[PDB]
Amino acid sequence: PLHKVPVGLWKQLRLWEGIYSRLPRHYLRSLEEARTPTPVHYRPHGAKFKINPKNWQRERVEDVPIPVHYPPESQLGLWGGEGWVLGHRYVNNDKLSKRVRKVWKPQLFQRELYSEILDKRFTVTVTMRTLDLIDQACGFDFYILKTPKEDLCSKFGMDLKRGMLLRLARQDPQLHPDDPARRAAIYDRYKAFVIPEAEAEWVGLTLDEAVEKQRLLEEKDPIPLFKIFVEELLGQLQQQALSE
Amino acid sequence: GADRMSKWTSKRGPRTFCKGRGAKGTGFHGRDGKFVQIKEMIPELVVPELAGFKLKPYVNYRAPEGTDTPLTAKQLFLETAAPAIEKDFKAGTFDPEHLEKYGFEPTQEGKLFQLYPKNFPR
Amino acid sequence: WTCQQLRNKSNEDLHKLWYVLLKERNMLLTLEQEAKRQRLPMPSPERLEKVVDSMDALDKVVQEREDALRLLQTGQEKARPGAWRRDIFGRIIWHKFKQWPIPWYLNKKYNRKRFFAMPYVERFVRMRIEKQARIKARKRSLERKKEKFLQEKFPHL
Amino acid sequence: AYEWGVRSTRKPEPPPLDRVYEIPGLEPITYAGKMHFMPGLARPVFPPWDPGWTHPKFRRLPPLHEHPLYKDQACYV
Amino acid sequence: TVIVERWWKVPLAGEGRKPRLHRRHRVYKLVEDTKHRP
Amino acid sequence: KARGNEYQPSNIKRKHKHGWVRRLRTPTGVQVILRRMHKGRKSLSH
RNA sequence: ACCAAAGCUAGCUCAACAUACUAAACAAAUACAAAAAUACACCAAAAUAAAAUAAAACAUUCACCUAACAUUAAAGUAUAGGA
RNA sequence: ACGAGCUACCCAUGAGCAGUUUAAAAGAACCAACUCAUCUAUGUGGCAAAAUAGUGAGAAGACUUGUAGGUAGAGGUGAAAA
RNA sequence: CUCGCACACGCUUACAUCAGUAACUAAUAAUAUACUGAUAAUUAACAACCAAUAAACCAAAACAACACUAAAACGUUUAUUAA
Ligand SMILES: [K+]
Ligand SMILES: [K+]
Ligand SMILES: [K+]
Ligand SMILES: [Mg+2]
Ligand SMILES: [Mg+2]
Ligand SMILES: [Mg+2]
Ligand SMILES: [Mg+2]
Ligand SMILES: [Mg+2]
Ligand SMILES: [Mg+2]
Ligand SMILES: [Mg+2]
Ligand SMILES: [Mg+2]
Ligand SMILES: [Mg+2]
Ligand SMILES: [Mg+2]
Ligand SMILES: [Mg+2]
Ligand SMILES: [Mg+2]
Ligand SMILES: [Mg+2]
Ligand SMILES: [Mg+2]
Ligand SMILES: [Mg+2]
Ligand SMILES: [Mg+2]
Ligand SMILES: [Mg+2]
Ligand SMILES: [Mg+2]
Ligand SMILES: [Mg+2]
Ligand SMILES: [Mg+2]
Ligand SMILES: [Mg+2]
Ligand SMILES: [Mg+2]
Ligand SMILES: [Mg+2]
Ligand SMILES: [Mg+2]
Ligand SMILES: [Mg+2]
Ligand SMILES: [Mg+2]
Ligand SMILES: [Mg+2]
Ligand SMILES: [Mg+2]
């Protein structure tokens, strides 16, 4: 006896039934798209085809990403899409030498960052690559709102984006109750990232969080059979009334 | 060794281990350690008067049976609440907002014997 | 007493009939035990079977009135609150609720019970599916074999 | 000075709140709806428990100054 | 941020398929470290 | 000096070392319960 | 002449099809020392699989060995190997 | 993964040491309960997968002992016998 | 001829009344505390379960008068609460 559906598709088919089926389509579409993240550790080669120096012939070359381990400590901060690199190495960089387990760890720093959308300071464990990406995007808010999920790789970042994305769509007057002119200036620069309300509250949710949110919205107490039967009786009485 | 496939009861363990056999507690421990038995927690059995009641545990063999019709929530409504609703609607006195006069109760916590929490044991 | 006969009786009537049955059942149990003590057969033991059947029918009809009245007022199928939970073993268990004087988050004992499956339970949950699949697969093939076997010995078709 | 408390023996401080509570204008998703712990969901923050009806044995001890005979002057007994 | 490359070559998979990864493909060598650059 | 009686019975020790409560307190212990449930054991634990 | 001998069912194996995949039973009690109605909580966690073996030794290496999306060929070819 | 219910050591909580000799409750002395096991003889598929009989050493201490808890194999523990 | 009664820990009806033992159990027979069938039983005063906070209090058990060094288990009262 064998399974009719292969085992690898059990998780995919889990999303097609039950509460997962009633989830909004826009959330599901973004979840199913598994795009390759921006290369961080390994250095990719631009050319798709390369010439073998030994063979002097045209050959095909492909970039293979190097697996990287993300510890749970990373999810509380902004590491810029990097983490521990687990692998082996050769001592003295000689092939005929001993094979040695080696772990490379990023250098972490403690900084507090300022976000214009939320006007709050967060003390976030950041890496030197994250600060370079902040300067590259010309703004902390730009860095969060421009880098996609696969590039950020942090639940804090997704929640930080979702907090600011809802702030823009709702156009909350609580950003600066005393400076309406300052409020207009802040939201004017990020006008290209504005998304509708139905899209801005599902960008930073995981699979477990969304199901709880979906259940909470659909949590309805059962309708008593007295109310159902009363409506049924009234329809018959009106039907009989209109028949005379 | 010991038997791991038997029932673990109070008789097997030491003097410290004293597990009840399934009774329902009827009190607590007071100041001096004397067991203070709460009067309310004791199940007060309620009995009717069977002296003037004519009925027996057995039925005559010649008595015919009946078509087994389990009671339905729809049949009960058509038997009790439907005649009152139907007469009121024909007279124009039906009020969709308030149905308390027909036996409907919005919240159960007001009454003494709830239904969904199942307050009464039996 | 049959089920239909008790539906014509009032709730007050059923309450009084329960104790008439109750006194009858106690007497029959006393006689049955005394029969064993005297090493003699119980006179007409089918009386006890009739009484317990009457008791169950009386319990059924009152329960038929309780749930029907509950559905009209509240619409809940079950009289004891509960919700479907996934225990540590990965199964789906209908967790009945219990009465407490303090909320769920202020309970020391309740907050120690776990309702969720750890990642290592996924492999064991998968194996239970395979075990049940093989049991059902063996059962289905056994039914086919018997049908072929009986046809050969009974070629009436 | 040398305080007589010990860090291990003293009651631990509450765990740090989840980062979701720090984001202005964002409703956190908690497991309080399912009234049991679930990994991946934020820990709820509950208001102090307020029993509508006071119970003699199980209530908290009233403060000393709540007693009617409490007086500011210190009397030695 | 460290930059590493594999010692052993990885066989190709040109139809958009994830390539087969072996134990000997875990052997990395540090070619450059971003913190030591000017 | 005369081995063979290494088992000295005790209910307090037996229920604390191999009890059902202890089996569910450690992640490795729960796997022991899962293995015995899969195998079809009549008694998962003491 | 004892001890013994003979029987053909119980069920199983490998597939195929296939719904789409933790069965049956859950009245009460079940993670206090499980199956004990009832009190102010703490709750939780991850770090590359290794080696037996092959190279007639053994250190670099040793298919499958967690995660492939298949079949006919290109082909055991280009390449990678104390080469 | 599972094992400190036997054993090595330790943390809790308990319980025993009668008589005799000495200003002595002095890791003193005679000798029981109690704890170890020196020598020899039976036993060697035995009563016993390490015992029985006689005889021995300590017996107010670095002593015996009950209940329960702690340390787990690249380790634990050890008045080193690997 | 002399390890006897009871509790704790453990075992779990192996205990009691009546009947049967050709055979099963006892390393044999009689036979029945030990094997089979039926019926019956251990009744709480003893034992388990059996309050919280604040404050005063340097002063050993060894017949304990009073001392030794190794510095020692063993709580009462007042106040605020306690179905
Ligand atoms: K232990
Ligand atoms: K012996
Ligand atoms: K026994
Ligand atoms: Mg056993
Ligand atoms: Mg006991
Ligand atoms: Mg006992
Ligand atoms: Mg009393
Ligand atoms: Mg191809
Ligand atoms: Mg043994
Ligand atoms: Mg012992
Ligand atoms: Mg070799
Ligand atoms: Mg060979
Ligand atoms: Mg290998
Ligand atoms: Mg080379
Ligand atoms: Mg021990
Ligand atoms: Mg003496
Ligand atoms: Mg001496
Ligand atoms: Mg001897
Ligand atoms: Mg001898
Ligand atoms: Mg002699
Ligand atoms: Mg001596
Ligand atoms: Mg001497
Ligand atoms: Mg362990
Ligand atoms: Mg060692
Ligand atoms: Mg020693
Ligand atoms: Mg030596
Ligand atoms: Mg040696
Ligand atoms: Mg035995
Ligand atoms: Mg005999
Ligand atoms: Mg007899
Ligand atoms: Mg008997």
Order of helices and strands of chain A: HHEEEEEEHHHHHHHH
Give Rg of chain B in angstroms: 26 Å
**Which structural category do the helix and sheet elements of chain A fall into?**
alpha+beta
Largest sheet descriptor of chain B: 2 strands, antiparallel
How many separate domains make up the residues of chain A?
A: 1
Percent range for β-strand residues of chain A = 5-15%
Number of helices of chain B: 2
If helices are DSSP runs of H or I spanning 4 or more residues, what is the number of helices of chain A?
10
Q: What is the succession of H and E elements of chain B?
A: EEHH
- Rg of chain A to the nearest angstrom? 27 Å
Classify the helix fraction of chain A into a percent range: 25-40%
Strand order of the largest sheet of chain B: 1-2
Number of strands of chain B: 2
For the report, how would you describe the main beta sheet of chain A?
2 strands, antiparallel
Oligomer: part of a larger assembly
Helix content range of chain B: 10-25%
Gap between N and C termini of chain A, in Å? 66 Å
Helix/strand/pairing class of chain B, anyone?
A: little secondary structure
Count of DSSP E strands of chain A?
Answer: 6
State the largest interface.
B-C, 30 and 34 residues
Q: Which strand order spans the largest sheet of chain A, edge to edge or round the barrel? A: 1-2
Please write out the topology.
The structure is cut from a larger assembly and holds chains A (244 residues), B (122 residues), C (157 residues), D (77 residues), E (38 residues) and F (46 residues).
Chain B: E1 27-29, E2 35-37, H1 73-80, H2 82-91
Antiparallel strand pairs in B: 1-2
Chain C: H1 3-7, H2 11-38, H3 46-73, E1 82-86, E2 92-96, H4 121-153
Antiparallel strand pairs in C: 1-2
Helix pairs in contact in C: 2-3
Chain E: E1 2-6, E2 28-33
Antiparallel strand pairs in E: 1-2
The complex binds potassium ion (3 copies) and magnesium ion (28 copies).
Chain C binds 3 RNA strands through residues 36-37, 39, 87-94, 96, 98-114, 124-133, 135-136, 138, 141-142, 145.
Description:
The structure is cut from a larger assembly and holds chains A (244 residues), B (122 residues), C (157 residues), D (77 residues), E (38 residues) and F (46 residues). Chain B has 122 residues and is mostly loops. Chain B contains two helices and two strands; from the N terminus they run E-E-H-H. Chain B has helices spanning 73-80, 82-91; strands at 27-29, 35-37. In chain B, strands 1-2 form a two-stranded antiparallel sheet. With 77 residues, chain D is mostly loops. Helices cover 0% and strands 0% of the residues of chain D. The two termini of chain D are 31 Å apart. Chain E contains no helices and two strands. Chain E is elongated, with a radius of gyration of 13 Å. Chain F is mostly helical. Chain F is built from three helices and no strands. Chain F is elongated. Chain F starts with 10 loop residues before the first helix and ends in a 7-residue tail after the last helix. At the B-C interface, helix 1 of B face helix 1, helix 2 and helix 3 of C. One magnesium ion (MG) is lined by residues 10, 13-15, 17 of chain B. Chain C binds three RNA strands through residues 36-37, 39, 87-94, 96, 98-114, 124-133, 135-136, 138, 141-142, 145. Chain E: Belongs to the bacterial ribosomal protein bL9 family. Chain E: It is found in: Mitochondrion. Chain E: Residues 2-33 form the Large ribosomal subunit protein bL9m N-terminal domain. Chain E: This is Large ribosomal subunit protein bL9m.
